[PDB]
DNA sequence: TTGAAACCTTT
DNA sequence: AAAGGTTTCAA
């Protein structure tokens, strides 16, 4: 329902839709898991704020 | 305001 | 215990 930065949205699409794990999102995107956590947290809070149109 | 490990909580 | 979320830090 919302288009934000490209970084935020990628990981929410990845983990929620195909139930992509965090190590999965990482090892496949070749990026640290902590980073997956931060991208997911901020994709969420950005949806929250911009779910109120 | 990014990337990332530490650090709590949920499963 | 391991995955999932959060708070915090340095660049």
Numbering used by the authors: 134 to 186
Reported in the publication:
Group IV sigma factors are known as extracytoplasmic function (ECF) sigma factors, because they are activated in response to extracytoplasmic stresses. The ECF sigma factors are composed of only σ2 and σ4 domains, which bind -10 and -35 elements, respectively. Of these sigma factors, SigW induces the transcription of its target regulon to counteract cell envelope stresses caused by antibiotics, alkaline pH, and high salt concentration. In the absence of these stresses, SigW is downregulated by anti-sigma factor RsiW, which is localized in the plasma membrane.
In the work reported here, we determined the crystal structure of the σW4/-35 element complex, and analyzed the promoter binding mode of SigW. The crystal structure contains a σW4 monomer and a double-stranded -35W in the asymmetric unit. However, residues 125–133, which correspond to α6, are disordered in the crystal structure of σW4/-35W. The residues on α6 are likely to be flexible because they are not bound to DNA directly. α8–α9 of σW4 forms the HTH motif, and α9 is inserted into the major groove of -35W as a DNA recognition helix. The recognition helix α9 mediates the major interactions between σW4 and -35W through hydrogen bonds and hydrophobic interactions. The bases and backbones of three purine nucleotides (G-35 and A-34 in the non-template strand and G’-31’ in the template strand; ‘ indicates the template strand of DNA) form hydrogen bonds with the residues on the N-terminal half of α9 in σW4. Altogether, α9 in σW4 specifically recognizes -35W, and α7-α8 provides additional contacts, leading to a tighter interaction. Like -35E, the narrowing of the minor groove of -35W begins at A-33A-32 and is stabilized downstream of the -35 element, even though the downstream sequence of -35W has an insertion of two cytosines (A-33A-32C-31C-30T-29). The crystal structure of σW4/-35W shows that SigW selectively recognizes cognate -35 promoter elements which have a narrowed minor groove, in a similar manner to the E. coli SigE. Comparison with the SigW/RsiW structure shows that SigW binding to the -35 promoter element and anti-sigma RsiW is mutually exclusive.
